Each structure stands twice: as C-alpha cells, then as structure tokens.
Design a binder for this molecule. Structure first.
Ligand SMILES: *[C@@H]1O[C@H](CO)[C@@H](O[C@@H]2O[C@H](CO)[C@@H](O)[C@H](O)[C@H]2NC(C)=O)[C@H](O)[C@H]1NC(C)=O
Ligand SMILES: *[C@@H]1O[C@H](CO)[C@@H](O[C@@H]2O[C@H](CO)[C@@H](O)[C@H](O)[C@H]2NC(C)=O)[C@H](O)[C@H]1NC(C)=O
Ligand SMILES: *[C@@H]1O[C@H](CO)[C@@H](O[C@@H]2O[C@H](CO)[C@@H](O)[C@H](O)[C@H]2NC(C)=O)[C@H](O)[C@H]1NC(C)=O
Ligand SMILES: *[C@@H]1O[C@H](CO)[C@@H](O[C@@H]2O[C@H](CO)[C@@H](O)[C@H](O)[C@H]2NC(C)=O)[C@H](O)[C@H]1NC(C)=O
Ligand SMILES: *[C@@H]1O[C@H](CO)[C@@H](O[C@@H]2O[C@H](CO)[C@@H](O)[C@H](O)[C@H]2NC(C)=O)[C@H](O)[C@H]1NC(C)=O
Ligand SMILES: *[C@@H]1O[C@H](CO)[C@@H](O)[C@H](O)[C@H]1NC(C)=O
Ligand SMILES: [Zn+2]
Lengths: 69, 206, 110
C-alpha cells in the first residue's frame, strides 16, 4: 500500500506529466528501470497462490489433451 | 462463467477454497457511520493528496454528478471521468454507498489525476504514453485501497481484526480468476485476428 | 524554413482546436447528464462541427513533409494529423464500409 509515502509519488508524477510527448519506452523506464513489458512482477504477485496450487494438484493431471470432446 | 469465457469470475462460488471464512467487506460498517456519496470522494482525494499528487479543483466539486438525480431528470449512469478541456474536469457516476463503488471512486479519480498532470502539453499530446497506460493507473490506484492495512486505517474494519492466511488465499484466487484467467483468451483472440488480416488463414479455415 | 512553417501552423491550429473541442465536449456532457432530446441535436451539431475542423486542418497539413523536422515534439504532432485515415478509400467503397460497420453493430445490439 503506497499511501503516506511521498517518494512513491515522485516516481509516478514523473511518468504522468509527459502525456505522449515521449516514446513510451522512455516513459516506462522513468518508473521501472527497463524498456519492455515484463512478466516477472506478475508472477511475484501470485506467489502464495502458486505454492498452494502446486501443493493441491499433487493427485491430478496438470495439463490437458486436445482430443477428448 | 460467461458467454464467451473472457473472465472466469463467476466460477467463484464453485471454487472458493475455504467456503467458511467469509471475504472482507465493509459495505455495512459504512452505513453505520452514515457514509454518503460525498464522504467517499473525500476519502479518495485524501488518499491521493497523501501520496504527493495535488488536490482537486473547485470546478470539480461544483459541476460533477457525484450522485444520481433519480427524479424526472435522468442520465446514463456508467461511471467515467471527463476532461472537457481548458482546465476543468469532472466525474459522472451514480454512486451507491457500497464497497465496489468505494473502489470505483479511486479508479476514476485515478484518470482525473492523470489528466490534471499533463494539461500543459499541446492539444495533440494529451493522452497516455500509449493505449494501455491510461487504464493501468486507475488499476494500481484501486488495487492499493482494498487492502486491510488501509481499510483498517481510514476508519472501517474495526481495529482488533486479524487477517488469517486463509482469507489471503480466498482473495488471491478471486483475483487470479479475473486477471490470469483472461490472459490466454486475450492472446488467442488477437493472434487469430492478426493472422486473419494477413491472409495467413484462408477464408475456409477460419 | 520548412520547419518554421510547420511550427507557425501548429501555433495557429492549437487555439481553434481547443475552443471547438470544448464546445463539443460540453455538449456531450449536458447530453449524458441531462438526457433530453432537446440536447441530442445540439450535441450532434457541436460534434460534427468539430469533426469537420479536423478534416480541414489535416488536409491543410499534408504540405509539410515529415523528414525535415528534427524537433521531435513537432514531428510528433504533425504525424497525428497527416494520418489519411479511411478517407484514402474511394467513395463507393468508403460508404460501403460504413454500412457494413453499422450493420454489424445493430445485429449485436438487437
Ligand atoms: C497516514 O499517516 C497519517 C499520519 O501519519 C495517519 O493518520 C493517523 O492515523 C492513526 C490511525 O488511523 C490515528 O491514530 C492518528 O491520530 C492519525 N493522525 C492524523 C494526523 O490524522 C493515517 O492513518 C495514515 N494512513 C494510512 C493508510 O496508514
Ligand atoms: C496457514 O498457516 C498455518 C501455520 O502457519 C498452517 O497450519 C499448519 O500447516 C502445516 C503445514 O502442513 C501443518 O503441518 C500444520 O499442522 C498446520 N497447523 C495447524 C494448527 O493446522 C496452514 O496450513 C496455513 N494455511 C494455508 C492455507 O496456507
Ligand atoms: C435539462 O434540459 C432541459 C432542456 O433540454 C432544461 O430545460 C430548460 O430549463 C431552463 C431553466 O432551468 C429554461 O430556461 C429552458 O427554457 C428549458 N429548456 C427547455 C427546452 O425547456 C433543464 O433545465 C435541464 N436540466 C438541468 C438540471 O439543467
Ligand atoms: C520545438 O519547438 C518548440 C516551440 O513550439 C520549443 O518549445 C519552446 O521552448 C522555449 C525554450 O524552452 C520556450 O520558451 C517556449 O515556450 C517553448 N514553446 C512553447 C509553445 O511553449 C521546443 O524547445 C523545441 N524543441 C527543442 C528540442 O528545443
Ligand atoms: C494522404 O493522401 C494524399 C492523397 O490525397 C496522398 O497523396 C498526396 O496528395 C497531395 C495532395 O493533398 C499531393 O500534393 C501529393 O503529391 C500526394 N503524394 C504524392 C506522393 O504524390 C498523401 O501522400 C497522403 N499522405 C499520407 C501521410 O498518408
Ligand atoms: C487541499 O485542500 C484542503 C482543503 O480541505 C486544504 O486544507 C489543503 O491545504 C490542500 N492541500 C494542499 C497541499 O494545499
Ligand atoms: Zn478506468
């Protein structure tokens, strides 16, 4: 929760007040530090669920066969 | 869940991990404190000003539709923000004192706080850095106001309230049904269209 | 001075763009907040009045060629008008297209 944290407002207010005046990769970098959409942070979000799921699917067949109908 | 399979949200009632532990809702602690559709849009503004972004503007409080008229005067109640230009902004939404509207308040003030920031650019340079940037700020605004560490501070969610590691799974799975469940669908649907538009799929194998 | 030209042009475009845009947005605001048929036609008036301004200004901006400008913040606006859009089609085709688009949406809606 980013509330009450002013240094998290700067990192955001620097990307906002550009509109479209800059390439979107330069805008991204002003917040994240990279130049491309990354799928790593989406996987840190669902970590405590991924663990639990890997534990719940012990006795099942993770995957699917594309011929049953 | 739904007609096409875009979102798997409606499968929640069949897959809730722990059906007994109920979710976190404050729709009721709100009515007990007389929370009208102005206490909400003040809590949102306070949230934003707390971060560092600026206040709202007078013209925002005057000419907005922060509650449905309901009389002979009708409207269209789909929530949204407006950037009419020249330096006035306004929100149009018929808000019911609820929780899902306590989130949409932050979602929309997100757009408004985006627009107020780049209103010093030439008229054609007023938009998100690309198409996916605009609604991706509203989300992180509403994503960080539904957390008990924040509800437990603004006044709702009575203080001696421990969250247990089973409500957290109850919550993350409700998210994954809406976020992750829709990624393969989106990707597959745009792959199909990209391939159809370049003749890579003959017109008899669509 | 091609660049200077492209500049002065934008300076002149901005004002009118802004004012017409206001008058066009206020109309749809009043329409959506106050649903009244006495508003629909006013909204359409201001709206297509604005939309025409765009066609005019765009075709007026095909003069300035892109690849001379290096002040990328004007190379960026010019790119946003010069888009020929769907007007590049013929006329029979271009009004067949709109018919197709309007039919496909009505079927879904009703
Ligand atoms: C943000 O910080 C302010 C001040 O540091 C917090 O306001 C305090 O909240 C506690 C508990 O709600 C009260 O006991 C204090 O009296 C409050 N002080 C003031 C000056 O209001 C606020 O709760 C914080 N917000 C979050 C979400 O943590
Ligand atoms: C929540 O945390 C508790 C404890 O931190 C977990 O309970 C223990 O889990 C271990 C792991 O298998 C068991 O061996 C113990 O018997 C459990 N203790 C009790 C008292 O039952 C619990 O599994 C966690 N829940 C989730 C959903 O992760
Ligand atoms: C909703 O729109 C109607 C007209 O579409 C407005 O009616 C006008 O009301 C003013 C006084 O308030 C009169 O002077 C006008 O003659 C009325 N116009 C018509 C066509 O009758 C009505 O006021 C609007 N409602 C709100 C809340 O602004
Ligand atoms: C591109 O041209 C614009 C002019 O339209 C330049 O912006 C001006 O910069 C000066 C000096 O900073 C300011 O005094 C003016 O107010 C600016 N114009 C406007 C309309 O505000 C811009 O600097 C040029 N690009 C570069 C890289 O210099
Ligand atoms: C936009 O469309 C026009 C056609 O109306 C393209 O062709 C140019 O049209 C102008 C007249 O407005 C002529 O003066 C030019 O000579 C035409 N181009 C050439 C190469 O002869 C125009 O090129 C299109 N521009 C873009 C950016 O799509
Ligand atoms: C925001 O508005 C409030 C009005 O209640 C005012 O007291 C406060 O000073 C404003 N914030 C800033 C940073 O000026
Ligand atoms: Zn939004």
């Amino acid at each position: 929760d980013i509330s009450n944290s002013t240094e998290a407002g700067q990192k955001l207010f620097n990307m906002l007040r550009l509109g479209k005046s800059e390439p979107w990769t330069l805008a991204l970098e002003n917040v994240v530090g990279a130049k491309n959409m990354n799928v790593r942070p989406l996987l840190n979000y669902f970590e405590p669920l991924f663990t639990w799921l890997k534990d719940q699917n012990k006795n099942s067949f993770v995957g699917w066969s594309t011929d049953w109908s | 869940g739904d007609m096409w399979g875009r979102f798997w949200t409606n499968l929640y009632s069949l897959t809730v991990p722990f059906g007994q532990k109920p979710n976190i809702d404050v729709t009721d602690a709100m009515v007990d404190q007389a929370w009208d559709a102005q206490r909400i849009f003040k809590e949102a503004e306070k949230f934003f000003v707390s971060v560092g972004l600026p206040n709202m503007t007078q013209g925002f409080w005057e000419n907005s539709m922060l509650t449905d008229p309901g009389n002979v005067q009708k409207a269209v109640c789909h929530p949204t923000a407006w950037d009419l230009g020249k330096g006035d902004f306004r929100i149009l939404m018929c808000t019911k004192v609820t929780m899902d509207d306590f989130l949409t308040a932050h979602h929309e003030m997100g757009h408004i706080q985006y627009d107020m920031a780049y209103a010093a650019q030439p008229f054609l340079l007023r938009n998100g850095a690309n198409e996916g940037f605009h609604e991706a700020v509203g989300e992180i605004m509403s994503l960080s106001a539904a957390t008990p560490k924040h509800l437990k501070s603004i006044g709702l969610l009575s203080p001696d309230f421990q969250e247990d590691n089973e409500t957290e799974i109850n919550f993350l799975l409700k998210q994954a049904l809406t976020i992750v469940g829709t990624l393969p669908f989106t990707y597959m649907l745009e792959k199909w269209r990209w391939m159809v538009f370049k003749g890579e799929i003959p017109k008899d194998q669509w | 001075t091609i660049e200077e030209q492209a500049k002065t042009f934008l300076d002149k475009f901005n004002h009118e763009a802004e004012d017409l845009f206001y008058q066009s947005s206020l109309a749809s605001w009043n329409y959506n907040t106050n649903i009244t048929e006495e508003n629909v036609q006013n909204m359409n008036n201001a709206g297509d009045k604005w939309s025409a301004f765009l066609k005019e200004q765009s075709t007026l901006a095909q003069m300035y060629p892109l690849q001379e400008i290096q002040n990328l913040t004007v190379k960026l606006q010019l790119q946003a008008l010069q888009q020929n859009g769907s007007s590049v089609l013929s006329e029979d085709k271009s009004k067949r297209l709109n018919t197709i688009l309007n039919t496909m949406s009505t079927i879904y809606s009703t």
